[PDB]
């Protein structure tokens, strides 16, 4: 099929479900293509998948999107060169590509039964923007009968916090909202900090919504724990010195132009949640070579 | 008349000839080797790489003249017979750590040779292992290395570089070949005095380049982007052992926040730890600290005088804390994680 | 008869870890666990590796739950789970392990001896490595009594010369004994209190130091006061080692807290003569102390040195990711 089709279905899928991300959306509608497919021989399959994934790139510019669809290209192919007959070839990778679309969906109940023996009793949680893996971790945290205190950012310019404390009234859990330019005046009263992820780097670094780095420095000179919970599909092969290193297609979306993302260094960092396990930022180097198989 | 400090390394002169106590039909030692043991004294040193060029290749001539013991094997004679060699080679002046990885490499070659082959088979598999090994682990490495650092280099950047390395002048010749554009700054120290062959080398192939001493090094680190440097060694606990003064370097350039970049090959990884800058390391001849300030020359007949010591070291240790990234053949790593991937 | 014995002596072992405990080093702890898990093994009836399996798992909770403080025990009962599963995964060549063999008893018999005889030759090669970390004319500072800083610092004593000083530890003073042993065999000691620890460190070259447990991030279980010492050695960047075998290391995070420490009776503080001042006082007595891994540099264990951040990969290689949790 077209690249028409390929939009189209990426976006109605988008639409259909909010309760979803863009890389999971990239992935079935790859393995549509997949199952859409006339071709005989394996690397004209390859060009053409290529080419798609390179399509669906344009569209929507973010981090995960290329590192899914570069993790499902070389996942789907471990043993597919066998047989000289072209249907029991792609028979095999349909089902081996059912198979991680099954696996991909179990992240977020490990990443919360993993973290939500980490929170104290009575105790403020500070975090920024809005994450929906970090809501799943709290409504855990609140089913084991525990109460705790929220504060949350506005997260200009789309005000993005105020959805989340507005999902967070509904479980009646105290929580407050605060500006862009009071970070640094109320991490006296904070405790610890988690936050999202949107990439993670080869060095142990992350980048994230704009806003991070300023909020990781300031826990850092008063000695606050810095925790980080992010998925294994977000991986990406990368090692960013300053904040000029980041490509420009991830800055600007498709100073004044307001960049969108920032890159955090693995000196201020903790400890990292990831469906692979508990990992200190060091153990990251060599877990990004194992997965990248 | 060492320091009481540094009493246990041993400090030798460039003026004992060790040659004069021999035959001049040499027949303890063999000639090539005593040809290289004496120009060891003078120079040839660069790195640990021509060193280990000229010791395998030394090598590689004595295993060609080799007869078999009617009542012995090759696998025991050789390595019985290698051991006076090497032995004579230290005491013409201490090894380094790529050639201790080489001799444990050739012994392991040696051991595993089975009996039933000839003379001539065993030596010309000898011959063409030495020659694999040499090919594989040092000029394809040399060439990963600056595909991969090539990458890290922009249009508009000032690269900071110190010493004479190899590595270092071939990556920046590559870069250059290839349509980049920026400048160098090269820093040096007495006594050796070795940046002029990089200045040398850089004014040849076309590069702009500034030259300047070591003390004035805060002086010029508000212009510098990026700080690239070579190494003798690598230590177990991530630790990076070079020539004296790469530690104050990194040390500044950490103050002024800038970035720091360590290149290395694969097989000079050692199993050492350490954890100062101090213990083991070599001294040198003191002499050479004479200034020739042509009228006056002070500290002449240094040895007259009762309480006066001059110290001469030749290495120094930097932790891992100051390093933030590391180019080998297998990618780029941080410092701390060299341990974990490398030993494998 | 089997049965019976083997009730009674788990029953004593229990009693004995819930009444305090007894002047046991470490290696006795390994050895009588290692030991009883091996006549467990010998006297019960079993077909297939799960019954054995849950069986040692409901024990090893038993014993764990037993005493917290203590770990050495966990980590045997885990090795001991790695070993069975890695013999079946041989012989056998989601997973099932109701497969049936006649070969699994003998080289899982073998496989525990082999471990004890391991186990055994430890303390020589820690002691072997002292002579390329101490020279002549230095200071070292140490705290509490330790039995492998003892042997350390005695072979090294043997062809040269130094100092050492001795930080008391004083809930308990226990830095006595170890400065009186010191002493015996010839070597300049001083003993000095808690409270001037900060003002000498300007004269000292190194610090070395013993624990209880090795956590997965690299951080350290210590005895009370270490915290103090760590943070004032880095204030002198002054380099910092510990000496702990491979039965100190455990797969655990810190994140319990609470039960971390242990408390004992506030008579060691304040004495009970005191009179009606006893009504109206709070007196807390911590023993343990967390010290995070920003503070250490190096680790000396029975196979050589190495930095903090690889001791991850040391656990990847020791227990099974499924046996974590009991």
Redesign the interface.
Same mark, same amino acid.
């Given at each position: 099929m077209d690249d028409k089709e390929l939009i189209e279905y990426f976006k109605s899928q988008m639409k259909e479900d909010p309760d979803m991300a863009s890389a999971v959306a990239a992935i079935r509608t790859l393995l549509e293509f997949l199952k859409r497919d006339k071709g005989e021989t394996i690397q004209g399959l390859r060009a053409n998948l290529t080419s798609a994934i390179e399509t669906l790139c344009g569209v929507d510019s973010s981090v995960a999107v290329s590192s899914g669809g570069e993790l499902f290209l070389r996942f789907i192919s471990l043993a597919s060169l066998e047989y000289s007959d072209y249907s029991k070839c792609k028979k095999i990778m349909i089902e081996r590509g059912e198979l991680f679309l099954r696996r991909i969906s179990l992240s977020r109940n490990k990443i919360a039964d993993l973290c939500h023996?980490?929170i104290?009793d009575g105790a403020t949680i500070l975090t920024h923007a809005y994450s929906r893996v970090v809501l799943r971790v709290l409504e855990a945290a609140v089913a084991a009968k525990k109460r705790f205190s929220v504060y949350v950012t506005e997260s200009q310019p789309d005000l993005s916090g105020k959805k989340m404390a507005k999902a967070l009234c509904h479980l009646n859990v105290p929580v407050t909202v605060v500006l862009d330019a009071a970070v640094g005046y109320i991490m006296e009263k904070a405790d610890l900090v988690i936050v999202g992820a949107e990439g993670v780097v080869?060095?142990?670094g992350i980048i994230n919504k704009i806003g991070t780095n300023q909020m990781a420095v300031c826990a850092k000179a008063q000695n606050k724990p810095f925790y980080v919970v992010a998925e294994s599909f977000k991986f990406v092969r990368l090692?960013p010195?300053?904040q000029q290193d980041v490509p420009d297609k991830f800055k600007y979306k498709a100073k004044e132009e307001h960049p969108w993302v920032d890159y955090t260094a693995?000196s201020l960092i903790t400890?990292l949640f990831t469906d692979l396990?508990?990992?200190?930022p /060091?153990?990251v /180097?060599?877990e990004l070579?194992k997965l990248y198989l | 008349s060492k320091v009481s400090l540094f009493s246990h390394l041993p400090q030798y002169s460039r003026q004992n000839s060790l040659t004069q106590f021999m035959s001049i039909p040499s027949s303890v030692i063999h000639p090539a080797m005593v040809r290289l043991g004496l120009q060891y004294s003078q120079g040839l040193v660069s790195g640990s790489n021509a060193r280990c060029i000229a010791l395998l290749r030394a090598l590689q001539q004595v295993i060609q003249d080799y007869t078999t013991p009617p009542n012995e094997e090759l696998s025991r004679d050789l390595v019985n017979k290698l051991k006076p060699y090497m032995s004579f080679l230290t005491q013409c002046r201490p090894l380094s750590a790529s050639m201790h990885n080489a001799i444990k490499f050739l012994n392991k070659e040696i051991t595993s040779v089975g009996s039933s082959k000839r003379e001539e088979e065993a030596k010309s598999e000898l011959r063409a292992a030495i020659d694999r090994y040499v090919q594989e682990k040092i000029v394809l490495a040399a060439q990963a290395i600056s595909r991969f650092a090539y990458q890290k280099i922009s249009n508009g950047d000032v690269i900071l570089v110190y010493g004479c390395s190899s590595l270092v002048s071939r990556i920046l010749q590559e870069a250059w070949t290839e349509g980049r554009r920026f400048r160098v700054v090269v820093v040096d120290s007495r006594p050796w005095l070795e940046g002029r062959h990089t200045l040398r080398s850089l004014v040849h192939a076309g590069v702009p380049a500034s030259y300047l001493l070591i003390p004035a090094a805060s002086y010029v680190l508000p212009e510098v982007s990026k700080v690239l440097l070579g190494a003798h060694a690598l230590l177990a606990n991530g630790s990076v052992m070079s020539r004296v003064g790469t530690a104050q370097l990194a040390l500044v350039a950490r103050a002024h926040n800038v970035?720091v970049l360590v290149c290395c090959e694969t097989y000079k990884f050692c199993e050492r730890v350490q954890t100062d800058a101090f213990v083991s390391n070599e001294l040198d001849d003191p002499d050479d600290l004479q200034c020739k300030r042509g009228e006056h020359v002070a500290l002449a007949n240094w040895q007259n005088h009762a309480s006066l010591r001059l110290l001469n070291l030749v290495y120094d240790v930097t932790p891992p804390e100051l390093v933030?990234?590391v180019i080998t053949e297998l990618g780029?790593?941080?410092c701390?994680?060299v341990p974990?991937?490398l030993r494998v | 008869a089997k049965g019976s014995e083997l009730s009674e002596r788990i029953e004593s072992f229990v009693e004995t870890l819930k009444r305090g405990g007894g002047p046991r080093s470490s290696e006795e702890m390994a050895r009588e666990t290692l030991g009883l898990l091996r006549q467990i093994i010998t006297d019960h009836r079993w077909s297939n590796a799960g019954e054995l399996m849950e069986l040692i798992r409901r024990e090893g909770r038993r014993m764990t739950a037993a005493q917290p403080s203590e770990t050495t025990v966990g980590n045997m009962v885990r090795r001991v789970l790695k070993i069975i599963r890695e013999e079946y995964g041989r012989l056998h060549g989601n997973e099932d392990f109701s497969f049936h063999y006649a070969q699994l008893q003998s080289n899982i018999i073998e496989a525990i001896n082999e471990l004890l005889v391991e186990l055994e030759g430890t303390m020589e090669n820690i002691a072997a490595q002292a002579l390329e970390h101490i020279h002549s004319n230095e200071v070292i500072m140490t705290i509490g009594f330790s039995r492998t800083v003892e042997a350390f610092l005695k072979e090294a004593a043997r062809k040269r010369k130094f100092h050492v000083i001795v930080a008391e530890c004083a809930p308990f003073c226990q830095g006595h004994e170890m400065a009186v042993n010191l002493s015996k065999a010839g070597i300049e000691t001083t003993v000095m209190t808690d409270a001037a620890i900060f003002a000498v460190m300007s004269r000292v070259n190194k610090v070395i130091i013993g624990t209880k447990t090795i956590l997965?991030?690299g951080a350290l279980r210590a005895v009370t006061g270490t915290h103090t010492l760590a943070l004032a050695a880095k204030h002198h960047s002054t380099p910092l080692i510990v000496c702990a075998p491979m039965f100190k290391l455990s797969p655990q995070?810190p994140?319990?807290?609470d039960s971390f420490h242990k408390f004992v009776a506030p008579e060691e503080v304040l004495p009970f003569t005191e009179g009606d001042i006893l009504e109206k006082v709070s007196v807390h007595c911590p023993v343990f102390d967390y010290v995070p891994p920003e503070l250490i540099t190096l680790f000396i264990s029975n196979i050589g040195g190495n930095a903090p951040?690889y001791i991850?990969?040391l656990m990847s290689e020791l227990y099974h990711?499924d046996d974590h949790v009991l």
């Open positions: 023996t980490f104290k080869e060095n142990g090692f010195l300053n693995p400890l396990g508990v990992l200190t /060091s153990a /180097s060599d070579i | 970035p933030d990234l780029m790593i941080p701390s994680s974990v991937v | 997965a991030n995070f994140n319990e807290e951040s991850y990969r990711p």
